[PDB]
Design a protein around this ligand. Structure first.
Ligand SMILES: CCCCCCCCO[C@@H]1O[C@H](CO)[C@@H](O)[C@H](O)[C@H]1O
Ligand SMILES: CCCCCCCCO[C@@H]1O[C@H](CO)[C@@H](O)[C@H](O)[C@H]1O
Ligand SMILES: CCCCCCCCO[C@@H]1O[C@H](CO)[C@@H](O)[C@H](O)[C@H]1O
Ligand SMILES: CCCCCCCCO[C@@H]1O[C@H](CO)[C@@H](O)[C@H](O)[C@H]1O
Ligand SMILES: CCCCCCCCO[C@@H]1O[C@H](CO)[C@@H](O)[C@H](O)[C@H]1O
Ligand SMILES: CCCCCCCCO[C@@H]1O[C@H](CO)[C@@H](O)[C@H](O)[C@H]1O
Ligand SMILES: *SCC1=CC(C)(C)N(O)C1(C)C
Ligand SMILES: *SCC1=CC(C)(C)N(O)C1(C)C
Ligand SMILES: CC(C)C[C@H](N)C(=O)O
Ligand SMILES: CC(C)C[C@H](N)C(=O)O
Ligand SMILES: [Cl-]
Ligand SMILES: [Cl-]
Ligand code: NA
Ligand code: NA
Ligand code: NA
Ligand code: NA
Lengths: 490, 490
């Protein structure tokens, strides 16, 4: 009647791979560097405690609950908790967000496979600072085809394109095998390899020393409070957006994975362990690679200005430029890209599974066909992100930034207010190997929803191409929900 | 088990309204004027005899045949005639073409409602020739929002937009009532009003006389052979493309309408009468309004240069400019626009019904829901045509020009070669009130397919926005076919 995680360890490593992704190694460092370093960290830690943890529990509980009744996605699950047609509609966001995010994230992930291939085989640039960074800027710019003139059009390289195809093939070959034999098996290999590669890279970074500094200066920058910044709302917004992204909250992905957890299996400890594994990967591992390397070679002020330059400057340009000045630096680049790739891959399979679970659960497609149609929608749609300059940024904003925070508050209200605070509490704790601390009941019912509602309260014409397409996506998925509900009646 | 046309007269007037549309009054005159006048007419007449007539019969026969088995659209019907999965796929064109065409045609139709409203109420320009034409050029340009600078972006007026909404509401209110009570009832009112308004307009045009000419000079220009041009392939291509457009061949619309014809009711005479009613409306009525008026005021050479200027110059700019120089010219403009509107409306409901019939027949939606989802897809998608300069031209090319000729040859091969020439023949003639002339058997099996295969053998970066979207449409409809075939299995 339903697929199930085979083992507790597999469960937890799958969920950890869901969370531990590009957010940890690329987004975190830039977010932290742009927002004062340790000035970012206080709100980040508070957000983890007031949003992260409690939404994680709530999403596992929603998933396990839907899964016991044969439903893994939010159009059905929201309706099970609130019997109103509007529940189904709000529910479409938890298919739309992950699909929209999958569209650009799988492409960025393919970049890491491509750069990994090129770094391994040594087809890389050979290098004044601008004189060292420029060939790496050009190498990224040719790969993705950054516009050279006024037209907002991208020309990715043939190699970029084919590597996107291979990346899709790889996602598909894991997903097509299912939960236990696909995602779970694969997490048990990927997560230890990922942890080992990151540890190696931190160790190697910790030894960098130049006339402008050492790695320790980067660790000081990141872990040193600046209580002046606690007053700035932007830091708080940045901190909470990062918490959501990094924990996969509000993307419907945690829910969908929890729907393969057996009805009475614990979610309290398992939920907290996944969350905690992600935070360690983010702040110890992701926090100790990029910022420290950048600071050791350029000093703080220049590392910050680099972070501010682009989402991708640090990870795809600067870090390999820095590695190129060290013995075996091209192979270190390889290992960094290969780290990003398995990090991406364990996350992208998590953000495709919701659309798969919808097609299997609500429309009764076989797994084969659900995975293939999903790959086809994501592949097709990614042509927008590959060819239209700033389409990616637009999707990341509506779905990956705003959308997720909105959807997180929505699922909280649906589960904890409408369905019932006490019934939600009970459902979270049922089968617990530990119980949720009792103060969290008040955090979930009052603090988390207030925190988020407060935050929420506080371009070129081609953006409309992207808005139009991703609104069309929402209408298409709303239509599929409609068909699913008409298949129930027959 | 199926909706049926109530009456033979209603049947024929519905099919005549399917055919008799904007093609007759706007496209024909421009096609004919651009291609030498009577130089166009010889190939046009030959195409009517070798493509028009025989494809009309074939499409009615395919429709009646599918309809007896509960299927009105080509994914199912192609499969019934050729039991191969590839038949279903080719079949998607006969949902995709009409949907794509509906997207831009309904918008152009809304223009006619808007101009009709403005002309009736006198909110029109008041007017050297350029001094008379320019205010009408501006009035069209503001209405649709033609770009004023370098960006390929349209800014339709608020009034244009709301009138598009009303136009959609009107299409919907006919379609939602069904075949007999909606399309059929409405054709019995619209077609006599349309014929009366056109006759009035021809009479009024026939009286125009200026120093540069009379209406008769325009009739001479159109009906005078130029045997030099018979050698030019472009004239032949133009002539055949017009035949398809004007008869609605290759848009899946004739088929879908024929699928509501009772199994043993005649299609030979009915088919020929519809075809013949359309040709008379095209060459006597559409041919005697615009070209003669234009020639009487400007002389032939200037009328030709006007035709060549744009698809819409003649009908939306020049003709009202000319009417403005005559007593009661603003009301004559109204009657012209109102003529175009009912002409459009009787055709656009025909090109939405295929998607409706698919949703009812293959996915079992009620009529209400099938009409509403269809209106929603068309409304949504039309934002591309409303806002992206030359998107309309792009859709008209792929679907309305190439697509239809390709699809016409495809349905011919499927029905007359694969299924069986003799079985096709028999199926066409069964229930005939007359029989198809026997020479036509050879035309259909050999001449029509050769003619079309021979013809078939013989921009700005934003075109890719439109190509991308309408390829996405094809994939979406292919997916719906897939769901439909999986609903059969369950
Ligand atoms: C512009 C956004 C639309 C998405 C689909 C783009 C289709 C690709 O378009 C094509 O790209 C190729 C490689 O750059 C080239 O062969 C062609 O010159 C170009 O037209
Ligand atoms: C299958 C979906 C079709 C949509 C059109 C996409 C066509 C992709 O086009 C490909 O892009 C590559 C990357 O720039 C180019 O290098 C290749 O030359 C080009 O063939
Ligand atoms: C934002 C909320 C911060 C959460 C920190 C909670 C840490 C656990 O707090 C503990 O909870 C136990 C179990 O209910 C109590 O018995 C203990 O007295 C208490 O220390
Ligand atoms: C550009 C093609 C995308 C299709 C959707 C376009 C959405 C409309 O976009 C909006 O148009 C309005 C009227 O012109 C204005 O209010 C706004 O300035 C504009 O952003
Ligand atoms: C419901 C589908 C939403 C897609 C965005 C379309 C927004 C339409 O936008 C409307 O366009 C009119 C015509 O230019 C403008 O005059 C109006 O000011 C504007 O509100
Ligand atoms: C491109 C083909 C032109 C079609 C013109 C056919 C006109 C009808 O032709 C007639 O067909 C009758 C019935 O089969 C025959 O009995 C007659 O001898 C013949 O004149
Ligand atoms: S996790 C063990 C491990 C593997 C390898 C990549 C060789 N390493 O440097 C460590 C010690 C991290
Ligand atoms: S079809 C009868 C008719 C009505 C009207 C519009 C008044 N006319 O001018 C004619 C005679 C065409
Ligand atoms: C979209 C999510 C799967 C992202 C993931 N939690 C990451 O940090 O990269
Ligand atoms: C697309 C078709 C309904 C067009 C119609 N035959 C016309 O001439 O306008
Ligand atoms: Cl490359
Ligand atoms: Cl206007
Ligand atoms: Na993460
Ligand atoms: Na991951
Ligand atoms: Na016509
Ligand atoms: Na019509």
């Amino acid at each position: 009647k339903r697929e199930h995680w085979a083992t507790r360890l597999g469960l937890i490593l799958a969920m950890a791979g869901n969370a531990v992704g590009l957010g940890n190694f690329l987004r975190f460092p830039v977010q932290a560097a742009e927002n004062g370093g340790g000035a970012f960290m206080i709100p980040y830690i508070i957000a983890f405690l007031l949003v992260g943890i409690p939404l994680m529990w709530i999403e596992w509980a929603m998933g396990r609950y839907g899964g016991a009744q044969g439903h893994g996605t939010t159009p059905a699950i929201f309706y099970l908790l609130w019997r109103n047609r509007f529940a189904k509609i709000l529910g479409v966001f938890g298919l739309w967000i992950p699909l929209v995010v999958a569209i650009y994230y799988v492409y960025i992930e393919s970049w890491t496979l491509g750069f990994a291939i090129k770094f391994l085989v040594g087809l890389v640039p050979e290098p004044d600072p601008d004189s060292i960074l420029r060939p790496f800027k050009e190498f990224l710019y040719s790969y993705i085809g950054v516009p050279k003139g006024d037209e907002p059009i991208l020309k990715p390289s043939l190699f970029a394109y084919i590597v996107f195809l291979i990346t899709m093939f790889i996602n598909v070959s894991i997903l097509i095998r299912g939960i236990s034999k696909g995602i779970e098996r694969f997490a048990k290999i990927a997560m230890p390899t990922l942890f080992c590669l990151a540890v190696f890279l931190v160790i190697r970074v910790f030894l960098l020393e130049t006339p402008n500094g050492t790695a320790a200066d980067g660790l000081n920058f990141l872990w040193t409070p600046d209580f002046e910044k606690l007053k700035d709302p932007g830091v708080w917004i940045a901190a909470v957006g990062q918490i959501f992204f990094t924990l996969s909250l509000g993307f419907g992905a945690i829910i969908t994975y929890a729907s393969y957890v057996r009805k009475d299996q614990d979610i309290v400890l398992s939920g907290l362990t996944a969350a905690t594994l992600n935070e360690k990967a983010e702040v110890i591992l992701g926090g100790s690679i990029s910022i420290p390397a950048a600071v050791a070679f350029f000093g703080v002020a220049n590392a910050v200005a680099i972070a501010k330059a682009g989402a991708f400057n640090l990870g795809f340009i600067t870090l390999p430029a820095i590695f190129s000045q060290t013995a075996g630096g091209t192979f270190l680049g390889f290992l960094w890209f290969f780290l990003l790739f398995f990090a991406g891959l364990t996350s992208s399979i998590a953000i495709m599974q919701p659309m798969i679970a919808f097609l299997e659960d609500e429309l009764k497609l076989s797994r084969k066909h659900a995975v293939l149609w999903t790959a086809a929608i994501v592949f097709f749609s990614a042509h927008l992100v590959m060819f239209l300059n700033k389409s990616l940024d637009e999707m990341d904003f509506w779905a990956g930034t705003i959308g997720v925070v909105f959807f997180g508050l929505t699922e909280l209200i649906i589960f904890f207010w409408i369905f019932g605070a006490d019934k939600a509490w009970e459902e979270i704790n049922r089968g617990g190997i530990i119980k949720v601390p009792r103060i969290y009941y008040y955090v979930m019912r009052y603090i988390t929803p207030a925190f988020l509602a407060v935050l929420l309260v506080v371009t070129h014409w081609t953006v409309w191409i992207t808005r139009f397409y991703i609104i069309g996506l929402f209408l298409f998925l709303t239509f599929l929900v409609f068909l699913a509900e008409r298949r129930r009646n027959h």
